[PDB]
Symmetry: C2
Amino acid sequence: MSASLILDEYLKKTASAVLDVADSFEKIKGEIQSPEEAKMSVARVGQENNRKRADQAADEIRTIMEDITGSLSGAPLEEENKVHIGIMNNKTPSIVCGYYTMDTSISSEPLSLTDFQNPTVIANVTKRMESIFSKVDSARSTRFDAFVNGVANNMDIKSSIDWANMVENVIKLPDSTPNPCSVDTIVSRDASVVKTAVNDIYASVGKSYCRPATQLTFMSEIEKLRKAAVVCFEALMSDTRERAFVEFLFYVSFKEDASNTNSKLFVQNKLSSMSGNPRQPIKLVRRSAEETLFGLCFMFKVMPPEFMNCIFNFYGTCLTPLLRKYGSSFEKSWAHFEEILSERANAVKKFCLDAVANLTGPVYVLILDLVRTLSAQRSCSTKFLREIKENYLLWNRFVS
Amino acid sequence: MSASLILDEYLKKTASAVLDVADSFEKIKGEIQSPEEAAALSVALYGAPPNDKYLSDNVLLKMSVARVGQENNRKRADQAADEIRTIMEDITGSLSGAYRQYSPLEEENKVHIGIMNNKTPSIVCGYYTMDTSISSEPLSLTDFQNPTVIANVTKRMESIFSKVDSARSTRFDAFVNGVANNMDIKSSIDWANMVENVIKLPDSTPNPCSVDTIVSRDASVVKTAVNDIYASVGKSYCRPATQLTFMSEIEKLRKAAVVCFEALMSDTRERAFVEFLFYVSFKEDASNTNSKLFVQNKLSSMSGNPRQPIKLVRRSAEETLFGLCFMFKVMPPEFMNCIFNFPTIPYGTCLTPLLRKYGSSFEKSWAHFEEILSERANAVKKFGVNDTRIDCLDAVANLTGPVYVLILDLVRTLSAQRSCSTKFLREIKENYLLWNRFVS
């Protein structure tokens, strides 16, 4: 349609409108609000400056999106104080080489369920429970008996110690085994399916609204974006899920070696680890079924109640309620994304009539929402991992 | 089917009319010249891109605003309100009402010393016990600057810094000499001297004690900003049409925005001081290291019973200088300045290059707020309010960027700042945790 029909369709529609009101004004009554109907250069520079101004706000989401998804692989005091064990596709841990070491001089046996369900190793810790709380706790809540039975009857605890054994035996065997340790200090599982998702967002905010103030109108460009968001959102949330579990165990079960009580050079070489010299493998020692039971127990009554219902069990729609009380809002901001993608999708299936705006484009305001819903989560995530390790700094202080 | 309904569809249909003309303008290699044709009450006869009027003057404005080709969205007037007024207020944790908020037991582990405006520390009542038996001499500037320990710490500095390198480990004494002979450290130790006396002395002594920390001693001036930033919609002069259009309103925001941002960057400034010194100028008690009583005492704070505070003891001049010269060697070179002048209240610009190491968010997003704001300010000042009527002043105002985006840049600037602050306050924390392991 050439420039003629461009105007005729306007003149017709804008005439059909003005006639409709009169045709419907057969009625007569009393009312006061009767809104009844029947520079160009300096006003322009307000736009030229704004268009390029708003073109960069989205452009500064190109950046942050890539920047915020550096967690999933891409492209150092925080590093060496972070656990390194990592779940691999075969549900068996996968660890970087040369970061730990384990004394194999004693024939260690894998403590199975019986080591946990023994009526003694639950009775001994039973009194150990109040030995913490009974000092100040509400003495009416001293019914910590069933609490010991709580994790005891929880048939999930089997899978816990099982994986713990899987975390256990893997360090024993060297790098010459069919379960080799990764050579680079990093681990990475879903870096590919997300890397093709971030460049998807770029291409979306890039071409779709260079300056098409109103163009997002294909059932493809919609889906070519919805699939980008749901992948990047879950993948990040997936890390927060798996990273929470994989560090919860290495802390509750494993324990720094005490025979090498020399803490004068342990801090020393740990600094060289930051330098670039080869790492000194830190030595760990396991813990008997008694205190590992005293770990899982205390670690429950301190975390929010939704923890055991979510983390111990093993887009998520299950960790989000637990995650709520730490972060500000990784969900309310996410609503506005699912709403505009909905109302735009509902319309584009029928035939804008739904999202009317000529100031900036719609795809500019969705990507401006996605960046800020992911920012909350990562900001919320790093607070959880800081909270759980904190309690580990407390449970460690008591027994050792 | 009354006047409301019949006018509603008209405004809606004519809105779709204008927007489809835009849709019709669809060609590849989109230029950067777009139609600002929508400066009217209903655009007409713009093919350029390719009887007795009343005098009430109040119904003349609101009516003309009711029918505007571009003012056809009130879901956006709320996302401004429903989000910004809420998340701006919420993100400000420099005050709190008596209702729900997010703070788990982690607050207890956080150090608790407040900086009273008189530059003297204010400590929450009864959260520390101290060895009041030995009334030793409070430390003095010459106690540090003795020629004895300045050599000793270096001898210890080689120790912890031995496994980093040997060849490039040529000399660092001059640095250690520097951190002592600096002109300001005297305030630090004197400020450290102000710690002990108030800590050991009784509660109601001439040096007072508080019930809860008011460490957000800007709570008055910052609440006035939230009393202000609501000038968008919520406050008394809730002029619903044309939010953020009157130049009087806009200049209120900038002043109210900047005061809210410098406050937070002053809060992380301040708390960076009060955490660092206390960590390096004190230590736990080597006598009463009973782990048993320790944990039950902490957990007592969660219960709400009167907690029995912890025991600490002032540190040796040796380890303090060692801790000082160490923390002045791990953090970026800027640190030595941002920790010194804090008792000499300014500026604050020196913290920005430091904090921007962690996250690239705040240093660039904040710049994007003053830009759009200044640009929108220039827009209205160029259009003399007395010259043009309101029906057009809005349509050119929102042309400079909608409201729910501008006042949202501040949030994703503010929240971005706090998100990287808590990293820095934690970065220096475990930095000291790694060092405290050595002194133990």
